[PDB]
Structures are given as C-alpha cells and as structure tokens.
C-alpha cells in the first residue's frame, strides 16, 4: 500500500485501457498516451489471453470481445477511437529459477518483471509469435509485473505465455498465480 486508497485484492493484474485518435507506432507512443490522461476504462486482467479480432480494438465492442472472460469487469464501455491499448500491473507468483516468455501479438508490447524488460516488441506488426530470451528470478514469491500492449488498427491479439522448463511447456498468466496487490488472493 502506498496511499490513502484501499486497493482491490483479486487474482489478476490491474488493467487500464487507453484509446486515442493519434497513431501508435511504438512503445514510447503508448506510454505517452498512458501518461497523458486517466484511463478510458479499468478492468481486472485475470486471464491474459486476448483476441484475436479484426476491425480495430478501439472501435465498437471490439475491446469487450478482445478481453473476453475479463470484459465483465470493465468500469465503462469506451467510446470509439482509432488506436488503443492496455496497461496491466500487479504481481505474479514465481519460484526462483529461469523463465522465458513466448508472446503472440498484433501490434507491439513490453513486459517487465521487477522493473526489468523481459519481452519487448517496439513496433507495429501483423500477428507474430516471438520466443524471448530467458531471465532469472532470484527469490520465490510474488514478483512485480507490468505489461503494455497496443493496436494501431486492423487486427489485434495479445497472448504472452511463460515457460518455467526451458521452453518445453508454456502457460497463460491467469488467476492461479496473479495478484493485484501482492497479497494472496482467496
Ligand atoms: O502492413 C501494414 C498493412 O497491413 C495491414 C493489413 O490489414 O495491417 C496489418 O499490419 C499492421 C501493422 O503494420 C497491423 O497493425 C494490422 O493489425 C495488420 O492487419 C494494413 O492496415 C496495412 O496495409
Ligand atoms: Ca492504494
Ligand atoms: Ca494515466
Ligand atoms: Ca466501445
Ligand atoms: Ca477470449
Ligand atoms: Ca468474466
Ligand atoms: Ca492508427
Ligand atoms: Ca493491429
């Protein structure tokens, strides 16, 4: 806790959605959007496997469809924009050891753990899956995590999977291991 507002405890990350009518070309553009205003909607990101869909995430009900099982936690239904994206933050339970992400996305994204980038695509792209380099966790427990992802338009998908076993199996980040505050969710 770091202010005077109690924070919701749930098995997920704290999600924020931002839309814009400017072009998002890269991570910097999306982070600047996040900095520029209050979120257009908030949600609980408890099953981080979104899309795929078409015809712009920021239009109509496409965000709801993209978020799927998480859309019932939306604070509002945003109005139309051309471009948009999400900012997720909270905690993930990981034992000490080596891990790596494998992420399918359109457009780009950045994932950080304990403040260090561990999976980055700093550009727009049609759907593509990257196997990212491995990283280490020094101490078992809840690790800080954040993610950004955006859609510049067109198709959209975001599925960042994680392997604990050297790339032999991967899992989606979901309510089994996510925490919004770092306390244990029940
Ligand atoms: O290559 C850009 C070109 O492809 C289209 C096809 O619909 O968009 C694709 O590529 C974009 C990244 O440049 C993705 O954002 C998009 O989702 C994907 O459909 C066109 O919009 C543009 O012709
Ligand atoms: Ca607080
Ligand atoms: Ca903001
Ligand atoms: Ca809408
Ligand atoms: Ca879905
Ligand atoms: Ca739901
Ligand atoms: Ca655009
Ligand atoms: Ca796109």
Residue numbers in the entry: 5 to 190
Q: What do the study authors state?
A:
Glucose, GlcNAc, and other glucopyranose-containing carbohydrates, including 2-deoxy-glucose, methyl-α-glucose, and two disaccharides (sucrose and trehalose), all bound to the Mp-PA14-Ca1 via their trans vicinal 3,4-diols (ionic bond length, 2.5 Å) in gauche configuration with a dihedral angle of ∼60°. This interaction is further enhanced with the diol being coordinated by the side chain carboxyl and hydroxyl oxygens of the DcisD motif, and main-chain and side chain protein ligands from L11 (Gln156, Gly157, and Asp159).
Bioinformatic analyses indicated the presence of an ∼20-kDa domain near the C terminus of MpIBP that is a member of the PA14 family, which is a carbohydrate-binding lectin module widely distributed across several kingdoms of life. The DcisD motif coordinates a Ca2+ ion that is directly involved in binding polar vicinal hydroxyl groups of various carbohydrates.
